[PDB]
Amino acid sequence: TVYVYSRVK
C-alpha cells in the first residue's frame, strides 16, 4: 500500500 509504506518513515 501507500500509507502503509509511508509509516516506516
User: Which triple of cell numbers denotes residue 5?
Assistant: 509504506
| Breaks in the chain (C–N > 2.5 Å) following residue | none
Count of alpha carbons within 13 Å of 5, Cβ hemisphere only? 2
Q: What is the largest CA-CA distance in the chain?
A: 14
Question: What SS3 state is found at 9?
Answer: coil
Encoded amino acid at 1, one letter: T
| Residue 3: DSSP 8-state | H
